[PDB]
Design a protein around this ligand. Sequence first.
Ligand SMILES: Nc1ncnc2c1ncn2[C@@H]1O[C@H](COP(=O)(O)OP(=O)(O)OP(=O)(O)O)[C@@H](O)[C@H]1O
Ligand SMILES: Nc1ncnc2c1ncn2[C@@H]1O[C@H](COP(=O)(O)OP(=O)(O)O)[C@@H](O)[C@H]1O
Ligand SMILES: [Mg+2]
Ligand SMILES: [Mg+2]
Lengths: 919, 338, 614, 97
Amino acid sequence: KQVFEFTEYKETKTFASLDNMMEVLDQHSLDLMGMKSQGKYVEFFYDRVEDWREKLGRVDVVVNEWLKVQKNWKILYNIFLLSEDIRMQLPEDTKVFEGVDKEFKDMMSEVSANPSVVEACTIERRDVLVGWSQAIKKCEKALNDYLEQKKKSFPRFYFLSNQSLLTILSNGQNAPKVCEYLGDCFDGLKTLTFEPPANPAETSKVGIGMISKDDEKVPFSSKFICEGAVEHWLLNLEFRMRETLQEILEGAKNTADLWDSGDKPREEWVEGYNAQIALLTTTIVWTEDVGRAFEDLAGGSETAMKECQKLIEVRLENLIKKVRGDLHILERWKIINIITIDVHSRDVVEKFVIQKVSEAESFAWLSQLKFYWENKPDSDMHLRQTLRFPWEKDKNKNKCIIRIVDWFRFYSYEYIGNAIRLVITPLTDRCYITLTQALNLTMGGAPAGPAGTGKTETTKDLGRAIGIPVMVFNCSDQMNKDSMAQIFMGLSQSGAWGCFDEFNRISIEVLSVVSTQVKCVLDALKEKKTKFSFVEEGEIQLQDTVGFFITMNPGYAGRTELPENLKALFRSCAMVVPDLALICENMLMSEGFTMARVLSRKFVSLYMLSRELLSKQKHYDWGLRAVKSVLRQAGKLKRGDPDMPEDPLLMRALRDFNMPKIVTDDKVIFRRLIGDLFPKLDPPTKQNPELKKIVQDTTKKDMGLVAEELFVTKVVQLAEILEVRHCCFVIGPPGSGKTCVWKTLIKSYINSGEDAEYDTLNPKAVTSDELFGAYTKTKEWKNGVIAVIMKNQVKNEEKYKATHMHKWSVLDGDIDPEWIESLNTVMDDNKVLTLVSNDRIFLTPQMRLIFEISNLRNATPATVSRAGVLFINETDIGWMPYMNSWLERSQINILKQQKEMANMPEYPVIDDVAKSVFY
Amino acid sequence: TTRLRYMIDIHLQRRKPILFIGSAGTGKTAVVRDYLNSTRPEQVSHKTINFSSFTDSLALQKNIESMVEKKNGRNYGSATNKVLICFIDDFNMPYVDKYGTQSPIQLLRLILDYGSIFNREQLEERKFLQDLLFFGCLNQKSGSFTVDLRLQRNFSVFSMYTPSSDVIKTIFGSILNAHLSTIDDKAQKMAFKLVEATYFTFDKILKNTTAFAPSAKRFHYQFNFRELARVCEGICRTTPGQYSGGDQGKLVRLWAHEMKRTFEDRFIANEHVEFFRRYLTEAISKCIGEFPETENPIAEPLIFTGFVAAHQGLDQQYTQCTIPVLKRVLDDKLEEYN
Amino acid sequence: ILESVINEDSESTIPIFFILSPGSDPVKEVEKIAKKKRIEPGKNFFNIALGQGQDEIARRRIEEGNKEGHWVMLQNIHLMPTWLIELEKILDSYSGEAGNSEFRLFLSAEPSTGIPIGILDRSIKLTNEPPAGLKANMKRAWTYFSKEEIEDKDPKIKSILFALCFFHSTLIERRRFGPKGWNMSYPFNMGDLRDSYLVMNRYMEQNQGGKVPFNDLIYIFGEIMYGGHIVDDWDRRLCNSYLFNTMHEQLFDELELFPYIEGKGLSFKVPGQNPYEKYIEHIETSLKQETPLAYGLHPNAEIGFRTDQCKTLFNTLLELMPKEQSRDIKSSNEMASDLIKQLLEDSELKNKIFNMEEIKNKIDAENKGPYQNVFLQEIEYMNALLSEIVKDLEEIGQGLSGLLTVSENMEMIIESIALSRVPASWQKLAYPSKRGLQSWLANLFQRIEQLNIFRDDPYSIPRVVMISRFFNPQSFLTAIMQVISRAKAYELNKLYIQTEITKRSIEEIEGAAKEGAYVYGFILEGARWDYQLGQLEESKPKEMFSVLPVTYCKAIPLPPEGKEDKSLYQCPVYKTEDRGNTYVFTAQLKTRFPPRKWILAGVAIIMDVEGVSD
Amino acid sequence: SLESFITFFFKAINRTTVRDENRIPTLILNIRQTIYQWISRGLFEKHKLIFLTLIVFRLMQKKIIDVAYEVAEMDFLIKCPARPGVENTLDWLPNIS
Ligand SMILES: Nc1ncnc2c1ncn2[C@@H]1O[C@H](COP(=O)(O)OP(=O)(O)OP(=O)(O)O)[C@@H](O)[C@H]1O
Ligand SMILES: Nc1ncnc2c1ncn2[C@@H]1O[C@H](COP(=O)(O)OP(=O)(O)O)[C@@H](O)[C@H]1O
Ligand SMILES: [Mg+2]
Ligand SMILES: [Mg+2]
């Protein structure tokens, strides 16, 4: 009596939910087949179980068969669906396929009339279904061959997933849908802006501008029309991106010379132009400037190097003031990426003055990544690389060239769209040398370092400075010869830098192919041939600008030793963790400190000394992630009082935020340690008088607890931490008033603003799966205890965000790495919640999380960094405030007045004579 | 017990919970179990919960749910303003995870402070719990050594002390004196001697910590009250009519046997057995003072059983049976079993 | 050997296994031998190289090979670990069948883990190692470079290439020395030398008549060409010395490649302009004998290698030594553990443990010092060590003489005591310095002795401290600077610690000198510090290590700009002889010789050398 | 393998040309040589020394060849423990020695 309802797919009845039946059928087959043969009584009546078992076995084959056909039929049918362009291209198969689809739609309707699918399937039906599936496969093979031709035509398509590729080819008319998936191909250029069309039904073709991943608009010179073939108009777009970047730079460099002497400031000129073009044109007029300083010092003027130093250091300061005054978040990095290159520039000229290098074409100058804007009338650039774009071949208009240690290659103009430039450091300068020399010799460049170095990010940021596209590939040991070959074939076709993440973890079998494939490309680059012949699909366009970068990790577990042949091809570079001074220096210049450099070397030295002299505590975070969250707080306070000097301000900030985390044993040493750095400077303790007053008043009025000067300071310190950090850890010893401190804060917020709902739970107590919520045996999702509070607090409950200014959910369990892993998305700065159901919930800016833990031993060091910690010393709270609350009975009296606990024992009346004896 | 009994009455009037700590032998569970019976069933409603180390937090809630009646609203408490007591035994023995914190224990903390328990069915419902009291009974050197200090803070700690000469003699001495007086006017003085004797043997074993102690292979070796209690129980089994007369020779034999059979079985090694027999002879010879050296008070041949009596047509009679008599009874009964 | 071993044994069913080192090809030698035995044009026999997809071709070739009788050579066998498990099954089937006579299977592979045991067993193993020597290594470097490329190149470019070949050669010879040498093992291939030539080659073709820049080229060789291998950066400075000494303006004129050679009498120079064939002949004659002195190491640094070589041959031989003599009456591992346990129980270890509360109560905490903070942190670490080792000892001592379950880690501790290696759990605690078990215990009690003198009059610092006997030496140095920063009036960050070697011995009662901190137990390797001269000098030949006298440690502000002094030499200090990521701080000392000499010699400071008196 | 060793062991017996004059002595000598040379080829240069030290110590342990030693002294040879206690040394002799 079992069955299979047909679910219409517009317009084919389908077997949906078959698996629930399928699993029951499999269970019946399992025990039923075994019992009949094994059982002696069952053996007598086997002529029954065996016939039934064969019927059960028959059902499964037919059931797997539609699933193998429907899913694949769905995909191929969707390639044919709404693709007249793709229909006309392969008529023999499209017609065969349409034949099969109509048959399938009919057979499924006939089945929804029949009972058991397996009984209906029989054997002849199963054979017919297998033949139809084989015919559909043939269509997929034919379609795959067509995709390869399209893949040869456009380099970006190889990088794009086949499911996406298929979607783009299907919707070739619908331009805005295609532009959506160009974000996956390119580093920037997420989508394109469009003129509203003549008929509203049609989607726009006319492209007026391009839109970045961060929404930075680059306007095109004239209208860009989407032509017919999807590959053909996308390749015209790929070139129109470059053309427009090139066209603005000629205007940018003319206005660049004009602003120097011009009345209009530098910082105002930077705003007008784009983040990429601005940063380049900074580096260009930096190299001209340095080049004019060398030519002067050949004349004999000592001050030429000191003035170039002085000038670069004034623009750095003038730009540092611009980041401090309120700006637009896009304009932040458009300006801060410039801060990270002008700091390096200043460090270069400092280094030149100290070493006393007075000759141009010294190694020290050849070493630096120089950008030259010159129409070289004796152009060697036609020999060094291949001329690709029109402007490179024109030789009448200034082109942008990029020189570094005997490796000169044109600025390819890819659009990166204001992604953050890494902090330049003497290691990265050295690293750029290794990679450029590898390319100069037409072989691969491999940086090997420990985990957390972010070597892949340095190689990307190098290609970004050059403006060549950079593609990032990650290998999970599922990579095949065929899947890998496609990437290399695609990469060669289109000038593009290939960086392999976790390349070390590759099967030594498939690696020995990669070595042969790479060797054949490298062998072609040495010959410098315009076309080369690969092992399979020989005829592919070669471009000299392509380069292959592989990132090995020596310490990684399950490491496979690379073959000696492959090791010889890829130049190894040594990679070390980036120096904490140079990262902290940037972060300080980001917030707008004039003396940032001097403070950074002092700041780093504190933290490094602090780890050694203080007792090892798990709650202490001395990592870079903690440093940024201390600086961000200091930066708001800097923006508040810019006129105050930097050293006294930093002093106050570092003490204030570290004091709470630090225990009493370490408080004395740490205070004296701080004195070492700023002995002359005297720190004044800053406390908010309004917040302190209301907390003291609320605690006497309604909490019935003694407002002790140490207690109230902790509440004020917590209130500050909740404002800056969305997620906070109220760590402490087993017996204190950790709970009372957060409870006092809420009742103060109620008196301050409006009522503040809080949802208390114990995460450790309840099972980790049940708390977050999981799927049952039946295909239905139950709401988790954390997950429902997140739905309830947004709307349709007591905790609803309507009248409440600040709500926060309290948690008082012992933190675990398994339990926190599910919550690690909320822990992070990005306010995103991940569940098993994949229901997306966003944490509001007015929502906070408070964790209350005795020991942070089970927690990971990374987890401590993620959130803002607060330690409450047992001795600072004390037990006196309880005793005083008990003798006064104010605490006890309040609990009886305002609780649902009606059945509460009456506490005796304490005599004034009795109280004074007990006290 | 009387002074702890007073402390409980004090701690029951208040909503402050109590926690008892001590060895397996100390006798904590029984001291609580006595009180729960003596309390009035209208004023106070008692229930025992025992964790076998597979008791999940969900399973504990099912036991609490059933105990607590459904008050008006989301709040759950007993009708007619009755106070609800839940007795917990083997508090630390629930299975501990990698992280060293017990899921079932952590639940109880959420109940004590916040007074709201989330039911695994309808997790949206607060399900507030009220007028609940929790009475801990914790054995040290058992499962988890110590429980969470944040729970232990909410509980008022109390300790049962290990057995003492003065404590043992007042407990058992009063049981035996009440039973031996019904047997015979004589052999009352022999009761007190047997109590000091059983202690003496018990005490000489505790002194030799190297010989006998808790270990991996000595998980059971642990010497409780129960072994003294069932020894005292098996004397009370002895009917008056058969033990009437001179109990200088017959009682010490019985005692010695019964004592021996709860200590020998405890011991794995034949070395430990030899050490015990020497302590048992020294103990007997001290409390008795003068005893015949002709016949050893304790001997391997000496067995006591109340099944031999049933074969001979005696009713509820427990006495020393000879090896050759035992052979004949078992061999006859085996034919009946076949 | 290879011609003999094929004919004499492994006629059939026994495939031949080759283990090749880098720069060695088994196929070239076997093919020559293969041709003499039987007619081998390359048709009859196939030299199939294992690649992905070519596994089916190799399977067909080996299957065909057995019935035909022609032998089959497979290369790069390690490259496919899945196919070896498949191959094993094919060999087992063919051993039972028993295809055609005079059939063999040659297999050649780089040594690696996850090779099937079954194959390695059944197959004969044959290893080919290239002759190991400076001269033999220089020769292998020139053989790699194609004759017809070097002849074409002019005398200038081929002369500097030569000096690079030497530079590559000398690095492989340093790798042979552990601490004294590199401090770390780094892979170096011929491809990394070839790479460096191809860059050099271009720089000479551009400059033409204009003089070649060494300054441009040397940076590349130090920071790029052999920078890629070195991560530690202490080895990089050593790497640049060799480079800086080899590459200079006078290189093109005949100049000694070996450093200084003042009274050494090697007289080995770069060959003058002559034909290519004449370059190799001169190389072979002038190198003649290979010594440590050639690389810049001291003679005692070679003796120290034979020591480190000797020691390894006995640590291996101990493992290999079978059945533990097969009884008989030598003391068992558990007896030897009980005896060491008794010696530790005889000592008052429980008394030696320091209660933190008692020491904190003695301190007022208002007059507390940075020194006092370091000791308090140090004694805490010691307490945690001393408690752990007493726990592990009293537990294992109970397990020996008492009936209790024996844990796996406790059996390992018993095994480690018999061997007399420091335990793994103990080694992890406290200092990372490797020693003998009996030496460790004697050293530990000298640490404990330094904390006992602290416990009495904590406020009064001892006149002479011993940095050789701390958990973190660096922590102490940060402390001495802190005390100076209070007394003075500038940032702690600006202050760098600067060591100055003193002629006074421990006898001097002068302590706590203003802007100062006394130190002792510093030991200098690869050189001798003469007291009378007051400077670093070449070591006594027979003396391996030279103990330093009382060291005075002053804090003073850093220079505003990077200043290089010829007199001052920057030597790193290391906690252990191994010197592998145990760098603490850079000590400075006055040297009449150039620094370049000492960085090349590898001269460093070690805290514990086992040459400490009493 | 056991099997491969057995074929080499037998081969060594067939290579012996002595006809029962001093076969039993010369066979033993020929086996040692035959097995050693097979294994030595298999071993690296550094290990070839280590393996020869074993063979002789194992012949000494079992006393197949007559050598003047002590069992305690062979254990001391393989591993030497540094014993502290005496501060008095000679100038030339190292403190470790
Ligand atoms: N100012 C005060 N004076 C006296 N008693 C106080 C004061 N503030 C809070 N208390 C009391 O001290 C105790 C603190 O309870 P709380 O739950 O905060 O402790 P905790 O040890 O942090 O808990 P947990 O271990 O669950 O995190 C309560 O009895 C509280 O009412
Ligand atoms: N007055 C008493 N009479 C008899 N047995 C008692 C008495 N007081 C305590 N006990 C003993 O206490 C034990 C039960 O309580 P307790 O010892 O606390 O249990 P547990 O060892 O499981 O924690 C039993 O051995 C019981 O005989
Ligand atoms: Mg609490
Ligand atoms: Mg009990």
